[PDB]
A paper describes a structure:
DNMDP and related compounds, or velcrins, induce complex formation between the phosphodiesterase PDE3A and the SLFN12 protein, leading to a cytotoxic response in cancer cells that express elevated levels of both proteins. PDE3A is a well-characterized cyclic nucleotide phosphodiesterase (PDE) that hydrolyzes cAMP, cGMP, and cUMP8,9. Here, we show that PDE3A and SLFN12 form a heterotetramer stabilized by binding of DNMDP. Moreover, we demonstrate that SLFN12 is an RNase, that PDE3A binding increases SLFN12 RNase activity, and that SLFN12 RNase activity is required for DNMDP response.
The dynamic motion of the two bodies necessitated refinement of each protein dimer separately utilizing the multi-body refinement approach in RELION25, with the final resolution for the maps for SLFN12 and PDE3ACAT being 2.76 and 2.97 Å, respectively. Residues 1–560 of each monomer of SLFN12 could be modeled, with the first 346 residues being guided by the structure of rat SLFN13 and residues 387–560 built de novo. The regions between 346 and 386 and beyond residue 561 were not visible in the maps, suggesting that they adopted multiple conformations. The structure of the SLFN12 monomers can be divided into an NTD and C-terminal domain (CTD), which comprise residues 1–345 and 387–560, respectively. The SLFN12-NTD can be further sub-divided into an N-lobe, C-lobe, and two bridging domains (BDs). The overall structure of the SLFN12-NTD is very similar to the rat SLFN13-NTD, with an RMSD of main chain atoms of 0.55 and 0.75 Å for the individual N-lobes and C-lobes, respectively. The SLFN12-CTD is comprised of a core domain between residues 387–541 and the PDE3A interacting region (PIR), between residues 551 and 560. The two SLFN12 monomers interact over the length of the NTD and a small portion of the CTD. The interactions are centered around four residues from each monomer: T71, F89, I131, and I517. The side chains of these four amino acids are inserted into hydrophobic pockets formed by residues from the opposite monomer.
Residue numbers in the entry:
A (entry chain A), B (entry chain B): 2 to 155, 162 to 345, 387 to 550
Write the structure that this text describes.
């Protein structure tokens, strides 16, 4: 339910997430928790997509009435989600209440010391923290995947006769318990939970519902750490209780378990692809010579490669659509490493000689600039990898320290509008600077469109800066770093010919 | 209250943490929460010290009686602490209940994709997560410190006249509120908490106690992110309440705030050292023409470098003492990057010719080894940087795939014991292999001591393997990786002359 806004005046990706309730008191008092979680999920997905797609704006309609950002705030859950996604929120996020809408300006994710290339809401990779199954964070998932990639995946020793207790004792006891044909009710186990043992108690009515939900994460955790045994039908005090069911119910539960396990995504770094080796068994529980219920014992063998509970929760924007990254793409991102100067001189001279009014217009525009660089091109759209527009005479990019980059479009057609072309070119330039260029600061690109009359009259048809508003951080840019990022982006785009004079 | 155990037979650092209650039920039912937290802190400090000092063993006396590791477990809080310290607990930790003691075998911390060189319980660096002050994790602290080190530390722009609301509005409103000479009781604020605003309500009796405790972390968070304003004396609904106090109480509170702020550690990456720029003000609250109480407003300016709430909580073992890393050392670690083969041939030939029984003893010992490498030295203690023992004839290190490394000490003195020398040499060798060598797997070093009689009689005085027990993971080692780590350690120790023949 996230759509790219094509009617916006901003020269960047604007994602509309629909009506969102804002304010700490307003969000904490929302009666419908499902709606609040859905709004949080939509905002988080939009933020992740913008982080992975070169930055942009999240536009949310303010659902609650009489909302003031200064007086109310944002909301604890949204802030917690932002903190989970981003280590330093002020470095990436800006908030602005514009009329009835809330704008979250999101900077592109930049490679840092952590080594992460993309942002993930949840890697859906689980591990065993001695007794608990926890979803690997970005750093843990990165380390796990790189270690498995490097190694293409992943008897007894004589010891002194000393009476010791280890996790191997619990694993052996659980294995012996697994092979028991029948069980006795109200008997205590000789083992407890460990890296290879998990014990859960579920009601009969909720068992089928929870098998589709919690079993995948425990199976992923076991297959990722060392394998293990999951026992369902034992209470907190390790007493055998079980759940009452019929043979048909047992068959249906076994089928559901098989479907849930086979649905789990699996990525292999080895040459020999393998399935998840699991064994499901049902042990009858006998009380006073009568069958009380059944205990479900699931043995999950150690897996050679990554096992996912669900597809990794990473998003991006492609073809003006918010798409979740496929497992292969996510794995590839995780494991695979990465005065005024008028240039070029020849093109500037040709443009100034062919069109006399263009030079006067450039001088008038640049009289207000303290120091900067102006780069001319026949079509800046082509240099960014987009389609050429033959009606545009030329494009000019201005990089100055006191102002954000400005793209100057010039056209000879009086009755045609070039707002969309210039906006798309500026959006692509910003994305290339952020991702390919390597610029690590907040950057926005403004546009100015001019009509060059044959008699030399110049008029400013469109001025982007006077129609859109940004946080102040976007209005101050580092000229040297901008030039370096532009040089790197042009070099990587195979469109660097004479933009920088050496 | 953590001491290095010098009476242990293990050839590694054994840290005794005293009596520790173990078991999930036992620990969750502990009446004294202070004692439980103290035990958890001691175990965590010992684990961090062992991780930073080349690995070792944590020995804890089992306080509770009738404790079985297989039946009871470890404890939720201890497991959570271990998970916080280590991304993958099974990769580093092994647990063993030996008699009345509990042994935690800890592998040395190895450099990984995260870039961390040491482990920290808490960096004590705080940041602002929009409304909350949170302690930077290891990755966040690493990124923050490296960014500040790289840059040697760390007007208005014209915008369209659009009615918008940002965090700057809240900051300006808080600044205006800061300069007010007097306040009126039961009036609502025009701003709320943000990246630059924190609002807390404290009782009069607990105000002095909490100033020494919670003020440093908020001051650190403000000085680390963007500065801000802290307001004490306002309830949840942003109504001005204040706290009743006298002028002497105000002076004492101001002195306590000054002492607390000046006590905070500060590290500077810039040339010009600066103090924490803060301003403390007390605003009277007037109700019906009478003074009700006072509101404390603290303005913390943005700081140029790192501000610590406390010294970073990182530990190591030096001179057989568990010492907390100093701030300078912690900063330096964070920000600054890093058949049977008989060698050497000449020394082996000389030893075999001088002592005939030595060759026979070596052959008898190596007849049981499938494949490995034996390296002889005049004194392996010298090659590891320790003091030479002239009574020891020679030392031999055996590296095999089926067995852990074994150090063979040979002596001609019948009435003297060399257990301590061999144990210290093995401990130093293990530490050098783990840290300097770069070995990333669990490794233990056994020792065997032999007496070479002048007539050629050989006797095994001490055999370490038969007297100590390790988890099975320590009994299987990678021979090629062990040789590579040994080569790297010898090269970095300037003691590599002819150990490996090329
Ligand atoms: Zn595989
Ligand atoms: Zn400084």
């Amino acid at each position: 339910n996230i759509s790219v806004d094509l009617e916006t005046n901003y020269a960047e990706l604007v994602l509309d997430v629909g009506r969102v309730t804002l304010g700490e008191n307003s969000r904490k008092k929302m009666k419908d928790c499902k709606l609040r979680k859905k709004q949080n999920e939509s905002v988080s997905r939009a933020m992740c997509a913008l982080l992975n797609s070169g930055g942009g704006v999240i536009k949310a309609e303010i659902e609650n009435e009489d909302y003031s950002y200064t007086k109310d705030g944002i909301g604890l859950d949204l802030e917690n989600s932002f903190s989970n996604i981003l280590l330093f929120v002020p470095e990436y996020l800006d908030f602005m209440q514009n009329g009835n809408y809330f704008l979250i300006f999101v900077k592109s994710w930049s490679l840092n010391t952590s080594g992460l290339r993309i942002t993930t809401l949840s890697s859906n990779l689980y591990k065993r923290d001695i007794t608990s199954a926890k979803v690997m964070n970005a750093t843990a998932a990165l380390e796990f995947l790189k270690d498995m990639k490097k190694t293409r995946g992943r008897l007894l020793a004589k010891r002194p006769c000393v009476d010791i207790q280890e996790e191997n004792n619990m694993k052996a006891l659980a294995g012996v318990f697994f092979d028991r044909t029948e069980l006795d009710r109200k008997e205590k186990l000789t083992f407890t939970e460990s890296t290879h043992v998990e014990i859960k108690n579920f009601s009969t009515e909720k068992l089928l519902q929870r098998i589709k939900e919690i079993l995948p994460q425990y199976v992923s955790a076991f297959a990722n750490t060392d394998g293990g045994y999951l026992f369902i039908g034992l209470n907190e005090d390790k007493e055998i209780i079980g759940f009452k069911a019929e043979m048909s119910d047992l068959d249906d539960l076994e089928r559901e378990i098989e479907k849930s396990i086979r649905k789990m995504p699996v990525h292999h770094f080895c040459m020999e692809k393998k399935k998840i080796n699991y064994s499901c068994k049902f042990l009858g529980v006998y009380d006073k010579g009568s069958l009380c219920g059944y205990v479900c014992a699931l043995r999950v063998e150690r897996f050679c490669c990554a096992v996912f509970a669900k597809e990794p929760d990473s998003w991006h924007v492609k073809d003006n659509r918010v798409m979740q990254l496929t497992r292969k793409e996510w794995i590839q991102f995780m494991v695979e490493a990465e005065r005024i100067t008028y240039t070029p001189e020849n093109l500037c001279r040709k443009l100034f000689l062919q069109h006399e009014g263009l030079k006067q217009l450039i001088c008038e525009e640049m009289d207000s600039v303290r120091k900067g660089s102006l780069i001319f091109s026949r079509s800046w759209s082509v240099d960014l990898g987009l389609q050429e527009n033959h009606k545009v005479l030329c494009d000019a990019l201005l990089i100055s320290q006191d102002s954000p980059p400005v793209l100057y479009t010039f056209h000879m057609v009086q009755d045609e509008e070039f707002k969309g072309y210039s906006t798309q070119t500026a959006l692509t330039l910003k994305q290339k600077l952020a991702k390919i260029g390597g610029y690590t600061k907040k950057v926005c690109v403004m546009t100015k469109i001019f009509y060059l009359s044959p008699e030399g009259m110049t008029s400013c048809q469109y001025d982007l800066r006077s129609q859109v508003i940004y946080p102040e951080s976007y209005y101050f840019t580092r000229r040297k770093y901008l030039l370096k990022a532009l040089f790197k982006a042009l070099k990587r785009l195979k469109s660097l010919r004479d933009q920088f004079s050496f």
